[PDB]
């Protein structure tokens, strides 16, 4: 028995996608609802839109854009060409917004159902789709990210804690540089890290939820995962005890590094995926490592939360669309019998109302 379930959803090459376009600059997956791929047939650039609830019928439309990102929940698409940004409601066949920047945008994404984040060489902006909103500057970039490839931007639920992540080669290894910004304090902190996420977590005995920041890193001296509360705890709350635990890289994977993290608030577990296709599962409360294995031979370059299972969905270099989630009927007996950790098994059973700790 395994504590996780693997599932193949699609092979993109079977939907007519050219394998040269399956990669970070041309394929976007902003949620589990859609995948968008930019392709060029002759001199005509186009976008292919795959509805994940009807994937055998993809739509190809002509474009003149260098990047395209679909809204997480709706057929509303953002396109850009250098400094020109445009937003379309596809079913309405209408241009809902247009804005001209004064810098090129090196990375962008949807950070909520209604707000786009825009990263330039110098700063980070938020752009709300509500009313007549224009972009607002959130913070200036820190010099520690100068010259990095920007690979992600994330926030907490309330958009008060903001995190930008870049990577580069230093001393023949892939080095991660993050910038954590506090909206209320107006202060940045540089942190060495590769992949991260925020989470809401309600501790035993507390009336309010805690806001947690979890980040993984491969440093000079090996891999580490950190779980720490950000900000002042709500009035009356016990503070969350911070944890730091090892992240294992085998001796044969000298160049591998963390590329993605999703946290399940249903199960309170952390899913961590590496560049070269290794999955790790950790308990969010204690930081205990539950499981590790290689699940892809091809590299993984994009992920999102998988809503149906509360897991993680991803796309590899070949075009396999794959997901991993907690196997609810096996996780408790696995932790008891394979990990031989009855303490964790009992906790996770009662905490998330799972079966299998009746016998320990």
């Amino acid at each position: 028995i395994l504590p996780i379930r693997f599932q193949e959803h699609l092979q993109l090459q079977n939907l007519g996608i050219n394998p040269a376009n399956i990669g970070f600059s041309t394929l976007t997956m902003e949620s589990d609802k859609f995948i968008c791929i930019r392709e060029k047939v002759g001199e005509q650039a186009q976008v292919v839109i795959i509805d994940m609830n009807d994937p055998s019928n993809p739509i190809r439309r002509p474009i003149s854009a260098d990047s395209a990102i679909m809204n997480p929940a709706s057929k509303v698409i953002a396109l850009k060409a250098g400094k020109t940004l445009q937003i379309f409601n596809i079913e309405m066949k209408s241009k809902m917004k247009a804005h001209t920047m004064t810098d090129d945008v090196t990375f962008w994404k949807w950070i909520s159902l209604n707000t786009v984040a825009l990263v330039t060489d110098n700063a980070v902006y938020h752009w709300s789709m509500e009313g007549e909103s224009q972009p607002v500057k959130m913070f200036d970039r820190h010099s520690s990210l100068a010259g990095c490839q920007i690979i992600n931007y994330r926030t907490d639920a309330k958009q008060k804690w903001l995190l930008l992540t870049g990577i580069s080669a230093q001393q023949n290894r892939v080095v991660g540089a993050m910038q954590l910004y506090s909206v209320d304090r107006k202060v940045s902190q540089p942190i060495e890290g590769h992949a991260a996420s925020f989470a809401q977590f309600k501790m035993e005995g507390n009336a309010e939820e805690s806001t947690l920041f979890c980040f993984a890193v491969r440093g000079q001296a090996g891999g580490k995962l950190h779980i720490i509360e950000v900000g002042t705890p709500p009035t009356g709350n016990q503070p969350f005890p911070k944890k730091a635990v090892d992240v294992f890289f085998p001796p044969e994977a000298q160049n591998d590094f963390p590329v993605a993290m999703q946290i399940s608030e249903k199960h309170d577990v952390v899913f961590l995926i590496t560049k070269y296709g290794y999955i790790h599962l950790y308990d969010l409360e204690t930081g205990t490592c539950i499981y590790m294995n290689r699940i892809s031979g091809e590299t993984i370059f994009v992920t999102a939360p998988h809503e149906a299972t509360a897991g993680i969905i991803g796309v590899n270099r070949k075009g396999q669309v794959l997901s991993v989630c907690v196997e609810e009927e096996n996780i408790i007996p696995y932790i008891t019998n394979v990990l031989q950790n009855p303490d964790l098994a009992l906790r996770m059973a009662v905490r998330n109302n799972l079966a299998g700790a009746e016998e320990l």
Partner: peptide, 7 residues
């Protein structure tokens, strides 16, 4: 300028 052709 129009970045997507819907017609």
């Amino acid at each position: 300028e129009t970045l997507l052709d819907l017609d």
